[PDB]
Design a protein around this ligand. Structure first.
Ligand code: DG9
Length: 681
């Protein structure tokens, strides 16, 4: 027979516990606001019962009422002390229960008066569990209140250990409390960092390559039409050029431009740059001189490895080292002493720019080794395999063709320029020589599925939305996904049946992929969001673009992990595979090229007769997006004149397929161009 102080924050004042206490003729005072020592109520309180109160009482108040302040906290203390106990008890998968304990100096650390276990079914939502636990602890309080008042119960100190969480710890998970226990723990596995001690990377690529050369020295390494070089021959010739290159001042993180057609000299030059210590800057010779001079200027590359056929195209801007000049090779054929760390730059490839000119993507040796070290065991690549070096060597799809197969002892086959686009002769060569594994761009892959091939066992594809699955061959089709920034690819799917949306697969080694909403919070399984990549595949950033590195390579505020903002939208499927749901941004992947349609606008608008331009992507029935360039000009400009105009500054793949002349552009109510209202032919 006294007075009771009920201190709560979220709970309702019409609770069963409150009504029960008043039924025992106890006058109860409900108070949610902060109480201080000078409060007029503190002198008339006989008992203080708190129940998930959102604040701590001043140490003066807690000591004055020592031995008479109790808290009903619905967790199995010491597990899940403090905030959001039920959620953390489920996420961390700790034992579950409710505990009525004394309040001591710290948060939910006092001795336990009463403790009871509870169980949650898999189908219950986190709200159901929260409610079920709240009901169980209230009934526990109703049965044991008489024992608590009379002090009959013997409090016992908490076990040593436990965890602790604060209010902000849940910000990252605010959108998650609406999911079944099964679905929640399913997301936890898909977003669980691998167990502490995960295999790191200590070696550089050429360290592993030379090791593999000494394992299969007389095995065919590279094949170019009739000629071919073995691993021993390739390793020695590259070492000769590397000694000469190193002797000319090539240092770690230095850039060495390479401008050559696909050939044996290319592979020799590529490895020579690595062994020398620097990173190679591939420059497709089909680029216009404007583009070539730009890459040479922006990149801090003084050395340009090229031939005499294309030497003049550089206009003496760089100290040229002709790959045909015999004095470019030293007598020394031994492997050079390794001077590179896995954190050093291995190459700098150029992709399209977001707002303006393109940015050199810096890829490290720890981003290529991780990819090759996963590729070889997963696909079971062996020296018996012969791989096609098909993709243009300025795109990282060529790094897949070349580097992953060399570490596996396989043989590289440079695709002859004549048979490159005549897939009939390519398939003929592949059936004759026995080409077993190769990566083919989506365009070439679909065309190859029609052939009656029987030699290949693994064809890897990717880069564009695959739609055709039917093929007469017995080879496993593999669909891969990943941006250049995250090293070649990050996910892999084994295609087995038709799908309305062929998934891109599961993450590769040491790669976590997070689906986050606009607020960067985790998305529940089945909820769309931005695909965030975490792990060893992350690059060093963009060359000479630190502002974009900070924007795209962010350190998560709650998690603290370094992640790359891809700008891509994706979702986790229930089975773990990822579904690609397009991209927020202006970009679009057209036949293997990441382009900014707006990055053509300055060149185009710079034309005297051109006032405004907007390049959109339109698909004709079969879903394949192509670019139409609408422009407002007085008179229509000849199609070929614009293609040559863009050809002076842009590569062929950045030249829109169609250009449409218009007298004026349609506008929205807000003044924006009404992109929806533009025609198409
Ligand atoms: P023609 O055009 O004049 O001659 C060209 C031909 C036709 C001969 C062609 O065979 C060729 O030579 N292609 C070489 C060009 C090339 O290799 N480009 C690189 C491909 S993109 C690369 C990484 S990326 O640059 O960052 N772009 C990937 C982004 O696109 C999305 N993506 C990735 N995978 C996708 C699939 N399977 N479907 C749909 N979209 C996909 C992501 O947002 C990526 O950010 C990727 N990684 C490939 C696989 C190397």
């Amino acid at each position: 027979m006294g007075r009771i102080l009920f201190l709560t924050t979220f709970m309702s004042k019409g609770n069963k516990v409150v009504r029960y206490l008043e039924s025992l003729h106890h006058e109860v005072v409900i108070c949610q606001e902060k109480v201080h020592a000078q409060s007029a109520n503190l002198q008339e309180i006989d008992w203080i019962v708190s129940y998930a109160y959102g604040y701590i009482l001043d140490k003066e108040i807690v000591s004055r009422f020592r031995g008479r302040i109790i808290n009903l906290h619905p967790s199995l203390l010491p597990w899940n002390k403090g905030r959001d106990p039920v959620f953390w008890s489920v996420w961390d998968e700790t034992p579950k229960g409710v505990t009525i304990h004394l309040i001591d100096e710290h948060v939910d650390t006092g001795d336990i008066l009463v403790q009871e276990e509870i169980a949650f079914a898999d189908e219950d939502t986190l709200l159901d569990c929260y409610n079920k636990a709240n009901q169980a602890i209230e009934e526990l309080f109703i049965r044991e209140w008489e024992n608590i008042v009379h002090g009959r119960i013997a409090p016992y100190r908490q076990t040593a250990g436990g965890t602790l969480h604060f209010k902000a710890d849940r910000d990252f998970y605010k959108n998650l409390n609406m999911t079944t226990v099964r679905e929640l723990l399913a997301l936890k596995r898909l977003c669980a960092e691998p167990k502490r001690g995960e295999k790191p990377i200590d070696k550089t690529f050429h360290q592993l390559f030379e090791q593999q050369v000494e394992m299969t020295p007389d095995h065919v390494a590279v094949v170019d039409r009739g000629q071919s070089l073995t691993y021993k021959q390739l390793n020695e010739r590259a070492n000769q050029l590397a000694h000469h290159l190193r002797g000319k001042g090539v240092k770690p993180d230095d850039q060495v431009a390479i401008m050559l057609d696909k050939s044996l000299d290319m592979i020799v030059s590529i490895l020579a740059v690595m062994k020398a210590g620097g990173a190679y800057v591939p420059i497709d010779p089909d680029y216009p001189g404007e583009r070539i001079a730009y890459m040479l200027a922006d990149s801090s590359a003084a050395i340009l490895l090229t031939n005499a056929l294309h030497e003049e195209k550089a206009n003496g801007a760089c100290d040229i080292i002709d790959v045909h000049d015999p004095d470019s090779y030293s007598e020394n054929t031994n492997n050079l002493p390794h001077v590179n760390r896995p954190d050093d730059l291995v190459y700098v490839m150029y992709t399209s720019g977001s707002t303006g000119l393109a940015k050199g993507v810096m890829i490290e040796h720890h981003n290529l080794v991780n990819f090759c070290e996963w590729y070889r065991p997963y696909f079971g690549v062996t020296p018996a395999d012969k791989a096609l070096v098909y993709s243009s060597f300025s795109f990282d799809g060529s790094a897949l063709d070349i580097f992953t197969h060399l570490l596996a002892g396989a043989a590289l086959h440079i695709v002859p320029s004549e048979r490159k686009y005549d897939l009939d002769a390519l398939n003929d060569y592949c059936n004759q020589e026995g080409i077993t594994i190769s990566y083919l761009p989506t365009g070439a892959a679909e065309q190859f599925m029609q052939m009656d091939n029987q030699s290949f066992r693994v064809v890897i594809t990717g880069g564009d939305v695959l739609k055709k699955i039917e093929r007469n061959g017995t080879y496993k089709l593999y669909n891969g996904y990943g941006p250049t920034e995250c090293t070649i690819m990050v996910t892999m799917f084994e295609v087995d049946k038709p799908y309305a949306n062929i998934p891109i697969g599961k993450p590769i080694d040491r790669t976590r992929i997070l689906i986050l909403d606009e607020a960067l919070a985790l998305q529940p399984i089945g909820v769309a969001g931005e695909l965030f990549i975490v792990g060893e595949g992350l690059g060093r950033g963009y060359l000479n673009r630190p502002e974009l590195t900070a924007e795209k390579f962010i350190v998560h505020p709650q998690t603290g992990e370094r992640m790359y903002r891809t700008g891509d939208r994706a979702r986790f499927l229930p089975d773990g595979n990822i579904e690609f749901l397009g991209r927020l941004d202006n970009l679009v992947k057209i036949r293997g090229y990441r382009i900014e349609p707006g990055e053509i606008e300055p060149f185009l608008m710079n034309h005297p007769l051109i006032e405004l331009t907007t390049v959109l992507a339109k698909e004709q029935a079969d879903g394949r997006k192509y670019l139409v360039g609408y422009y407002v000009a007085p008179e229509e400009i000849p199609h070929g004149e614009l293609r040559e105009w863009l050809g002076n500054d842009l590569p062929d793949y950045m030249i829109p397929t169609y250009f449409v002349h218009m007298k004026a552009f349609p506008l929205t109510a807000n003044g924006k161009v009404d992109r929806r209202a533009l025609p198409d032919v």
